[PDB]
Design a protein around this nucleic acid. Structure first.
Ligand SMILES: O=c1ccn([C@H]2C[C@H](O)[C@@H](COP(=O)(O)NP(=O)(O)OP(=O)(O)O)O2)c(=O)[nH]1
Ligand SMILES: [Cl-]
Ligand SMILES: [Cl-]
Ligand SMILES: [Cl-]
Ligand SMILES: [Cl-]
Ligand SMILES: [Mg+2]
Ligand SMILES: [Mg+2]
Ligand code: NA
Ligand code: NA
Length: 326
DNA sequence: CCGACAGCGCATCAGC
DNA sequence: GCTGATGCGC
DNA sequence: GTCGG
């Protein structure tokens, strides 16, 4: 946290561009800058110093000098005072309400938690669940609870079929002391890149979890991706645990490594790694790594027997999950 | 300068 | 109904 | 907003 003030500033700017300006590239520019500065092992003393880092240009350098000299940024000061911006930024905090819907609601005069609650009939299913658990979704998940959550999911999945393999990825797998949610990667021998010998593979698991009352709500659900809400059981006379966001992503078993790589992140790490891959002549997704032809068209999937193999293809030294938190 | 910026699942919609 | 675009999120 | 060619 040597540069917490600067990274917070850039993150706020990133959120402004994404949520209010709807300028996704500026949003990513700011996040990339915050990221590289977040790992820079020195307390930054000037914008010039910061500008030496990749992702930090002239504009950000200037902002860093202003922040260093005054402890704040006029641009953000004004943004915070702008009611429209503030309202739109707030609404996007509800799961399911993005930049477009927030601006629409604000036009309709809906700009507060109270307003949303009085207009629940104007929200789609996802948004409705997001509003319902607004508070809870704001709370972090102590790793201690993530461990209890992992135990339940793995045991319940085992009960459905001993051949399933559930792996908790995301921030949990990177060793984080607390997580925003639980990301579960799921595989079964019946579902491979070559065939699906068993339908409802994901359904059966979600069903078992609801039956035991672990999964309490559903945000979205397809044949390979489920996103919903879950809750740990509490004891007698004990206050209940906050509801938590959970996702179960079913991936073809023979494509496990590309899958766990993708699901372990971080998101910015994946962006950087996939970008590097392109420069090296490859393309990486959660299923495979393919070479790029002289035309740019992805070729056939290359053999993969470990996460490290993927790193080898792009000439990157292997990085443990804990060191991928960019 | 200037095009590129990672890659994709599910929900909802318009047009047919 | 379908396909394709778009919103939203991982 | 940043940057490689
Ligand atoms: O833009 C994205 C978002 C997520 N992901 C991948 C990497 C990330 O680690 C994983 C899980 O997504 P989350 O949004 O759950 N983030 P993470 O688990 O890293 O952190 P936390 O949940 O604690 O915020 O999905 C991407 O590749 N791109
Ligand atoms: Cl943009
Ligand atoms: Cl500020
Ligand atoms: Cl693929
Ligand atoms: Cl690790
Ligand atoms: Mg997560
Ligand atoms: Mg997640
Ligand atoms: Na730079
Ligand atoms: Na949102």
């Amino acid at each position: 946290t040597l540069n917490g003030g600067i990274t917070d500033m850039l993150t706020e700017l990133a959120n402004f561009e994404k949520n209010v300006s709807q300028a996704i590239h500026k949003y990513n520019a700011y996040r990339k800058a915050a990221s590289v500065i977040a790992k820079y092992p020195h307390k930054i003393k000037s914008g010039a110093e910061a500008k030496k880092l990749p992702g930090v240009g002239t504009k950000i350098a200037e902002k860093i000098d202003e922040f260093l000299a005054t402890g704040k940024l006029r641009k953000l000061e004004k943004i915070r005072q702008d009611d429209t911006s503030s309202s739109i930024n707030f609404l996007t905090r509800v799961s399911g309400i993005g930049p477009s819907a927030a601006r629409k609601f604000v036009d309709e005069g809906i700009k507060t938690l109270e307003d949303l609650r009085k207009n629940e009939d104007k929200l789609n299913h996802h948004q409705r669940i997001g509003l319902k658990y607004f508070g809870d979704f704001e709370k972090r998940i102590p790793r201690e609870e993530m461990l209890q959550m992992q135990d339940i999911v793995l045991n319940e999945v085992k009960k459905v079929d001993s051949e399933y393999i559930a792996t908790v990825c995301g921030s949990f797998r990177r060793g984080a002391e607390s997580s925003g949610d639980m990301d579960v990667l799921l595989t079964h021998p019946s579902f491979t890149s070559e065939s699906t010998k068993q339908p409802k593979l994901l359904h059966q698991v979600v069903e078992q979890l609801q039956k035991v009352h672990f999964i309490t709500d559903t945000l979205s659900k397809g044949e390979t991706k489920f996103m919903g809400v879950c809750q740990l059981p509490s004891k007698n006379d004990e206050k209940e645990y906050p509801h938590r966001r959970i996702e179960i992503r079913l991936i073809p078993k023979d494509q496990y490594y590309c899958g766990v790589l993708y699901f372990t992140g971080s998101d910015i790490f994946n962006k950087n790694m996939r970008a590097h891959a392109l420069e090296k002549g490859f393309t990486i997704n959660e299923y495979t790594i393919r070479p790029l032809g002289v035309t740019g068209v992805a070729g056939e999937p290359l053999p993969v027997d470990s996460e490290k193999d993927i790193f080898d293809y792009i000439q990157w030294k292997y990085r443990e999950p804990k060191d991928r938190s960019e």
